[PDB]
Amino acid sequence: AATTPLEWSPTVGIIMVIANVIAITFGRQTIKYPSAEPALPSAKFFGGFGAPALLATTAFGHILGVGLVLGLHN
Amino acid sequence: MFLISWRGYWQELIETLVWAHERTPIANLVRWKDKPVALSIVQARVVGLAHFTVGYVLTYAAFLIASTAGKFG
Amino acid sequence: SHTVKIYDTCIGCTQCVRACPTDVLEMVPWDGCKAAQVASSPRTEDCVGCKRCETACPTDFLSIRVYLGAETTRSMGLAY
Amino acid sequence: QSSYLIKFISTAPVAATIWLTITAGILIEFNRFFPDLLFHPLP
Amino acid sequence: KARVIVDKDPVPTSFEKWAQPGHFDRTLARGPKTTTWIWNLHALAHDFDTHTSDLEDISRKIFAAHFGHLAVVTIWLSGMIFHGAKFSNYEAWLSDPLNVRPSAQVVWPIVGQDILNGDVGGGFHGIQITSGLFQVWRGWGITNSFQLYCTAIGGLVLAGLFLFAGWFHYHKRAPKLEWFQNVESMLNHHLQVLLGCGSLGWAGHLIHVSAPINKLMDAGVAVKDIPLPHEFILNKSLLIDLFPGFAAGLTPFFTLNWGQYADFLTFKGGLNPVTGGLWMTDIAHHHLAIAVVFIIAGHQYRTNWGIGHSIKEILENHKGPFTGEGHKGLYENLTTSWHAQLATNLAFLGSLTIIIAHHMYAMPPYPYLATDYATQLCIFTHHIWIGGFLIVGGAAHAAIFMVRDYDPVVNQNNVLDRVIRHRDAIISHLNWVCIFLGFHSFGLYIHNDTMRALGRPQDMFSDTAIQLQPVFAQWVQNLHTLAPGGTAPNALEPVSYAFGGGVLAVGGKVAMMPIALGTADFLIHHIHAFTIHVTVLILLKGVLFARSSRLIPDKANLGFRFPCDGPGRGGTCQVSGWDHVFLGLFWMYNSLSIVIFHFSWKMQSDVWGTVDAAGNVSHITGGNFAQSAITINGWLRDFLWAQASQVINSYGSALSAYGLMFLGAHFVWAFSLMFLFSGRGYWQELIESIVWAHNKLKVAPAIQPRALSITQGRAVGVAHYLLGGIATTWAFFHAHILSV
Amino acid sequence: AQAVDASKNLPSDPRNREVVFPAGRDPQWGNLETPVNASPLVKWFINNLPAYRPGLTPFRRGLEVGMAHGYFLFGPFAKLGPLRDAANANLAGLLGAIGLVVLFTLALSLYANSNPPTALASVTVPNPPDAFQSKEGWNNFASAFLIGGIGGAVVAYFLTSNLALI
Amino acid sequence: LSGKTPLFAGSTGGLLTKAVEEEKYAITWTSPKAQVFELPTGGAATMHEGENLLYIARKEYGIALGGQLRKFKITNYKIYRILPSGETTFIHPADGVFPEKVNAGREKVRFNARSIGENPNPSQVKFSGKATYD
Numbered sequence A: 001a002a003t004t005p006l007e008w009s010p011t012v013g014i015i016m017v018i019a020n021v022i023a024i025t026f027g028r029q030t031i032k033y034p035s036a037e038p039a040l041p042s043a044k045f046f047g048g049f050g051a052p053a054l055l056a057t058t059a060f061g062h063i064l065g066v067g068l069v070l071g072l073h074n
Numbered sequence B: 001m002f003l004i005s006w007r008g009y010w011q012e013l014i015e016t017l018v019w020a021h022e023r024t025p026i027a028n029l030v031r032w033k034d035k036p037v038a039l040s041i042v043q044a045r046v047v048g049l050a051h052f053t054v055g056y057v058l059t060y061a062a063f064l065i066a067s068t069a070g071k072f073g
Numbered sequence C: 001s002h003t004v005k006i007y008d009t010c011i012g013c014t015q016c017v018r019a020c021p022t023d024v025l026e027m028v029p030w031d032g033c034k035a036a037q038v039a040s041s042p043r044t045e046d047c048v049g050c051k052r053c054e055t056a057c058p059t060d061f062l063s064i065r066v067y068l069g070a071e072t073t074r075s076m077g078l079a080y
Numbered sequence D: 001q002s003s004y005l006i007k008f009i010s011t012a013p014v015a016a017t018i019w020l021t022i023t024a025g026i027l028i029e030f031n032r033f034f035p036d037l038l039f040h041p042l043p
Numbered sequence E: 001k002a003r004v005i006v007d008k009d010p011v012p013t014s015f016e017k018w019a020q021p022g023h024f025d026r027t028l029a030r031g032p033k034t035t036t037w038i039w040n041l042h043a044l045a046h047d048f049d050t051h052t053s054d055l056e057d058i059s060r061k062i063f064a065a066h067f068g069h070l071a072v073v074t075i076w077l078s079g080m081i082f083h084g085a086k087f088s089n090y091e092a093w094l095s096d097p098l099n100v101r102p103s104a105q106v107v108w109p110i111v112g113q114d115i116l117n118g119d120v121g122g123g124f125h126g127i128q129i130t131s132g133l134f135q136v137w138r139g140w141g142i143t144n145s146f147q148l149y150c151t152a153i154g155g156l157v158l159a160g161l162f163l164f165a166g167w168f169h170y171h172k173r174a175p176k177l178e179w180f181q182n183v184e185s186m187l188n189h190h191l192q193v194l195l196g197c198g199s200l201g202w203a204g205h206l207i208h209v210s211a212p213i214n215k216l217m218d219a220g221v222a223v224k225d226i227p228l229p230h231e232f233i234l235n236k237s238l239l240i241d242l243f244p245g246f247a248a249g250l251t252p253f254f255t256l257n258w259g260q261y262a263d264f265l266t267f268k269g270g271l272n273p274v275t276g277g278l279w280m281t282d283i284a285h286h287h288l289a290i291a292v293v294f295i296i297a298g299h300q301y302r303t304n305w306g307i308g309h310s311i312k313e314i315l316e317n318h319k320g321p322f323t324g325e326g327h328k329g330l331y332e333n334l335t336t337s338w339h340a341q342l343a344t345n346l347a348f349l350g351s352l353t354i355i356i357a358h359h360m361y362a363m364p365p366y367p368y369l370a371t372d373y374a375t376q377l378c379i380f381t382h383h384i385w386i387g388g389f390l391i392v393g394g395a396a397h398a399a400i401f402m403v404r405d406y407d408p409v410v411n412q413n414n415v416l417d418r419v420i421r422h423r424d425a426i427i428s429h430l431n432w433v434c435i436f437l438g439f440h441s442f443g444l445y446i447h448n449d450t451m452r453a454l455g456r457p458q459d460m461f462s463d464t465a466i467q468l469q470p471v472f473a474q475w476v477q478n479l480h481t482l483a484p485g486g487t488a489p490n491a492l493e494p495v496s497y498a499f500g501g502g503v504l505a506v507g508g509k510v511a512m513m514p515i516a517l518g519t520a521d522f523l524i525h526h527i528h529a530f531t532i533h534v535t536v537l538i539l540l541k542g543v544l545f546a547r548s549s550r551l552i553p554d555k556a557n558l559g560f561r562f563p564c565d566g567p568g569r570g571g572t573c574q575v576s577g578w579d580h581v582f583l584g585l586f587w588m589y590n591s592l593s594i595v596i597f598h599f600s601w602k603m604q605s606d607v608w609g610t611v612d613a614a615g616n617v618s619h620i621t622g623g624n625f626a627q628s629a630i631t632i633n634g635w636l637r638d639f640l641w642a643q644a645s646q647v648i649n650s651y652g653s654a655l656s657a658y659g660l661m662f663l664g665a666h667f668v669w670a671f672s673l674m675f676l677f678s679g680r681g682y683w684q685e686l687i688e689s690i691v692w693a694h695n696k697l698k699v700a701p702a703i704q705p706r707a708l709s710i711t712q713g714r715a716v717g718v719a720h721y722l723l724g725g726i727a728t729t730w731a732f733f734h735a736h737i738l739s740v
Numbered sequence F: 001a002q003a004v005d006a007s008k009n010l011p012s013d014p015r016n017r018e019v020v021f022p023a024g025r026d027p028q029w030g031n032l033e034t035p036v037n038a039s040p041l042v043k044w045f046i047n048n049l050p051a052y053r054p055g056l057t058p059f060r061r062g063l064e065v066g067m068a069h070g071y072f073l074f075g076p077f078a079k080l081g082p083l084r085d086a087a088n089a090n091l092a093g094l095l096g097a098i099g100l101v102v103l104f105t106l107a108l109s110l111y112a113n114s115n116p117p118t119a120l121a122s123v124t125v126p127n128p129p130d131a132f133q134s135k136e137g138w139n140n141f142a143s144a145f146l147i148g149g150i151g152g153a154v155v156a157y158f159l160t161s162n163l164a165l166i
Numbered sequence G: 001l002s003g004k005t006p007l008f009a010g011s012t013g014g015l016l017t018k019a020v021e022e023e024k025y026a027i028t029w030t031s032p033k034a035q036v037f038e039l040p041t042g043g044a045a046t047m048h049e050g051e052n053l054l055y056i057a058r059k060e061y062g063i064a065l066g067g068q069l070r071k072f073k074i075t076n077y078k079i080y081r082i083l084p085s086g087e088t089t090f091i092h093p094a095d096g097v098f099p100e101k102v103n104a105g106r107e108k109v110r111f112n113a114r115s116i117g118e119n120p121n122p123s124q125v126k127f128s129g130k131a132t133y134d
């Protein structure tokens, strides 16, 4: 049969946050041009990249997080 | 083939086989005495037309004989 | 090998010598008053017979004519 | 100008196309009403 | 760094250029001194590289030219949909799709065309179509004529917008070159929007409109009772009765509880038993899966914000030991030359069209296609033939790039430069494969044809005698049968019943059936590989030796399209890159002509045919393919002579036109031989003596007549040779199946 | 940042090392030195084959060649030839195999009796092979091919026919 | 013959055994600058600063190459004919002047004072060994 139902819990939110943290650490070193034209506020807190890399490294995190949440939910 | 695909395409193809034979290790021993070249233009018209005619002759002969002989009428 | 024959109707365009790939042709002077230029065929052994000279001749019909004949390694353009 | 447009119809294809269509239309017109003809009838 | 620069009022919009033909080039513009000017006016019309050296004018012409082309395709597609509205039996076909034939054309009551209007069911007398548009419109969820009428109007409106755009983008608002060179922006936009979002929207259509409509129509609901598409959006109770997944709403989507949507998003992986066709739910799950992939795939490239790759960096970093500098310099080629981009886009698009034909027959993706044997063959054949033509064009433009746009500085010890250096080894070995395959693949037919005539069937290469079983294909077949529950645990059925499984019978006819591979299929698959290799030999040799050869060192200065270089060097005829393309088209024909016959005879013999309720299948030809397809006489006897009976006897019936074009096609094929075998040297002499008669009667023409050029005479021949060739099989396939 | 982009265009980079080279040291020659053409494994094998081995007589070269081919050509005639499903199937293979050996020997003598042009040198074997550059050497090669060819086929006949006892 | 070979890794399109057995030609030229040029038979090469030398299988490959060098503004191209015995000859510009331009030392060769139209009919010349075009 199809995959069983999944009820949203804080565990799912934690996995999504952990996946983004992997992507941000991955995107920090890997990206060749983190800085860009749009400048975010308080760049020290965002590791010194702007709005474009913010949406990027958060997106691959969502892909990872999505992949893990459904992957673990066999 | 001989009526349509004229010479100068084939002559380039022959030059490649000459390279392979002169460069393959064991067949370097044996070699042509007469340099191999593509057939001339007038020759192909001869060789091609003979094929066109020999086929035109035989395949009708088999039809005429077998159709009549198969029925005998 | 092939024979390149050049006739009286030459006018001295020099185009035949340029179009030639094998340098079979050469422009020579005329003792006559016609011009200081006539085409020649000094080294006919290198003639391959590509008729490029006959494409660059602006006469009513060809002043320079290429007559095919006996073949050789050079006239057939065989690098093997 | 209008003169430039008239010459476009004057060219071979557009002139040949309009003429042959007018020519073809007449035959398709005649075969419609008068259906089939193989010989002129004899008085 | 991907800005939008647009020039203002580049060229006027006068009608004066229409009046003066030959405005392309300085030579044609001078005047029509001879009749060759007329033929040259057409052969150069779309050759913008010759008109102007300025690359901007080349790109602007091309970008506007595509728009006028899309207007043609939209007008064509709108006409099909319009004919489906007025002159069609679609509304009757929906009620009884199995026992009613599809028709969309009606000839007029004139000299005797009216016999062509034949009883196709539904009270409509017309020509039976084989394009399959009826199955398409049903899968789209169209259940009435007015709904089909509106779609036609939109295409015509859409056609005008494309036509307006090209005027707008060539006369008023012309982009500069660097707008076109932003390939990284071109790929993001085409991948995510055109392919990604375009697929995403279609998933919304299949879920809301098609899948409920198809489900109701499939469950016995009459078309009058089926609600309209808009009612599903307003009233959700209807969708919930059919697909209860909608009751949860959109909350399971965001919370990743995607199991709630298992009703209308599935992996059944098989055909619907009632209607031969893939489950619409899978087609909904299909496009939803791919849109995410395409949308993700597009973000790879940089496009002004620093996030992504330079394609130059990826190529230059893909070097290796055996390739010195690797792909260094290629990105400049694809960005510099339009021809190179055409060669890649045309070659791979052609291979898609062949791959599409193969997936569609084994996995019929529309309702009631499999029962319609007529629509399957005509679709499978048309797509292969299209892809064959495009693949040949890819080799032509590859040579045009090499003659015109190839720079030695850019391609310096790159991947392309090395290939040119050892072009001899590539061709000499490919030559060995062509002879090896031709001897083995085809000689085995001669051995069987010889042995059967001698009366030695024990020695044939047959299934009972000495046999060559395709064990590898039999094995790959077996894995796909066992993948459901094994390496595809969420799959209920095998992907296609062609690999295995069980017989599927939609009505009396069989939709799909396992295709057992015997010794006969072993030989034919090598025949196809044989004919494909020779086609590559002709075309690949055309590309590499287009620039130079040992016979002709300077082939570029002569051009891509030139007939010869004199009768020297033996004979230098058909040495150009053009003439190689001229030869490959004959082999592309011979390559693909066997493919359609291999498909036509096998499916008739092994797959298609009426099935009894007890479980007995009666194929059309009854196992004729196993023992007869191993000899040339069998293809002559059991396939050509036998199946062509309906064609010649079509006179005095609705299929009589097929027998005519079947016959008239033989004319054009032979008419081609007049040009291929003959030569201009004869024809200018005949025109000479005919001109004397006109000079006598003072009917002499001002434009002096001239015989067709050498390469043109070859061009006209292959045109007729393929036209008369393909059109023959077109009528043979149509009339044989429309009767059977 | 740059995992590999900084490493390119360096001689130390493994990608930049070149395996292919010009024939000998002159690039103007035709051939190209490749692993298939100029590797030590292929050079050892080809150069020490009977046709190319150093310090052998022309007769001894052909005997090694003929014994190989004679023992090879028995197979296709026996199992796949006519009368392959008969008691005398292996016998037909011995006669047919020797038939090719005779035609093969006849071809050698014809190419020999015609003054042969040369024996060529290549990358895989730099030296010329042997005294195959003369009318006399090729003739001795032919006489040796026929002896080994008949012997090899008999050996294949004896082993295959007597395989059950073995 | 003295000169530097243009640097290229090699190519199957090039000299064959006919070079060693029968004859080979060689083209020589001098450059102001090191550039890239397409070889006569496949590939590209980097010509050196001065006194370049290249061996070619046929004479056509050299004059075809000479036309390409002229587009790089190099007219001091010279061709030689190398026989297997090492004999070398100054073939293409036998006179220092190019063939297109005139020189006094040259003489007419195979000239017909008549026109092509005035050629003798072949029936007048048969069983004699003579040809009409003489």
Ligand code: CLA
Pocket (backbone or CB within 6 Å): E011, E012, E013, E014, E015, E017, E018, E019, E023, E060, E061, E062, E064, E065, E067, E068, E069, E072, E163, E164, E165, E166, E167, E170
């Ligand atoms: C609005 C009207 C209009 C007008 C007055 C012009 C006028 C002009 N255009 Mg233009 N153009 C228009 C609309 C117009 N265009 C549109 C809508 C497009 C987008 C497709 C273009 C795209 C375009 C390009 C790309 C180019 C021009 C060019 C030109 C100039 C030369 C055209 C010429 O002499 O050939 C006149 C040619 C024709 C009348 C034949 C056109 C054939 C049509 C488009 C296709 C028909 C397909 C048909 C269905 C095939 C059936 C085949 C079968 C049945 C036999 C001229 C100033 C050229 C130019 O400036 O030269 C430097 C140029 O390169 N135009």
Ligand code: CLA
Pocket (backbone or CB within 6 Å): E042, E043, E044, E045, E046, E047, E048, E342, E346, E389, E390, E391, E392, E393, E394, E396, E400, E560, E561, E578, E581, E719, E723
């Ligand atoms: C995306 C597709 C595509 C595009 C954009 C081009 C574009 C081009 N091609 Mg090309 N080509 C293609 C596909 C394509 N080709 C394919 C698939 C092939 C293989 C068949 C070729 C083979 C090819 C050759 C061999 C040559 C070109 C050339 C050219 C250039 C000039 C052509 C010209 O002036 O047009 C005008 C062309 C014509 C007027 C020819 C008309 C041919 C007709 C349509 C054939 C009849 C078919 C028809 C369906 C029959 C039924 C109807 C009939 C009975 C009424 C131009 C850049 C030429 C070149 O050298 O480029 C610089 C050239 O010599 N092409």
Ligand code: CLA
Pocket (backbone or CB within 6 Å): B001, B004, B005, E431, E434, E435, E436, E437, E438, E439, E442, E443, E444, E446, E534, E537, E538, E583, E586, E587
């Ligand atoms: C039926 C007609 C026919 C045949 C048999 C061929 C055969 C061939 N063509 Mg071809 N060609 C043809 C028509 C044909 N062409 C036409 C009409 C055109 C114009 C479009 C071309 C254009 C064309 C091109 C452009 C090219 C070819 C190529 C080839 C060769 C491919 C190699 C191969 O298959 O191995 C040889 C296979 C055979 C000859 C098949 C039959 C052999 C049987 C099994 C063996 C004979 C039995 C026995 C030994 C007889 C002994 C008798 C004894 C008494 C002497 C081959 C010689 C390609 C080529 O040369 O690449 C290698 C190539 O590039 N052809």
Ligand SMILES: CC1=C(/C=C/C(C)=C/C=C/C(C)=C/C=C/C=C(C)/C=C/C=C(C)/C=C/C2=C(C)CCCC2(C)C)C(C)(C)CCC1
Pocket (backbone or CB within 6 Å): F067, F068, F069, F071, F072, F147, F148, F150, F151, F152, F154, F155
């Ligand atoms: C792995 C490999 C391979 C394979 C191999 C093979 C497969 C082999 C061959 C095989 C062979 C081909 C073998 C053969 C052998 C033979 C023999 C074993 C012979 C025998 C002989 C004898 C013993 C004889 C004797 C005699 C004489 C001479 C005279 C008198 C009589 C008698 C009989 C006594 C190759 C190299 C390809 C490549 C690389 C790797």
Ligand SMILES: CC1=C(C/C=C(\C)CCC[C@H](C)CCC[C@H](C)CCCC(C)C)C(=O)c2ccccc2C1=O
Pocket (backbone or CB within 6 Å): B001, B002, B003, B005, B006, B007, B008, B010, B037, B038, B039, B040, B041, B044
């Ligand atoms: C294939 C082909 C070739 C290449 C073909 C060659 C080199 C012929 C090779 C055939 C060999 C010689 C075997 C033929 C043997 C015959 C069966 C018997 C001939 C012997 C008689 C004299 C008795 C051309 O040279 C050519 C030239 C001009 C137009 C078309 C073509 C052409 O189509």
Ligand SMILES: CC1=C(C/C=C(\C)CCC[C@H](C)CCC[C@H](C)CCCC(C)C)C(=O)c2ccccc2C1=O
Pocket (backbone or CB within 6 Å): D016, E674, E675, E676, E678, E679, E680, E683, E706, E707, E708, E709, E710, E712, E713, E714
């Ligand atoms: C027949 C033939 C010709 C001659 C073909 C010609 C001259 C075709 C002429 C086609 C049309 C019919 C010419 C006249 C077009 C007129 C404009 C038509 C009149 C207008 C009305 C129809 C409206 C070649 O030139 C040739 C060249 C090389 C290889 C083979 C051949 C070859 O086979």
Ligand code: SF4
Pocket (backbone or CB within 6 Å): C006, C009, C010, C011, C012, C013, C014, C015, C016, C017, C039, C056, C057, C058, C059, C063, C064
């Ligand atoms: S007429 Fe011909 S031969 Fe005389 S100069 Fe001109 S091109 Fe040369």
Ligand code: SF4
Pocket (backbone or CB within 6 Å): C004, C019, C020, C021, C022, C023, C024, C025, C046, C047, C048, C049, C050, C051, C052, C053, C054, C066, E568
């Ligand atoms: S045929 Fe060729 S080689 Fe002879 S003169 Fe003309 S161009 Fe020169």
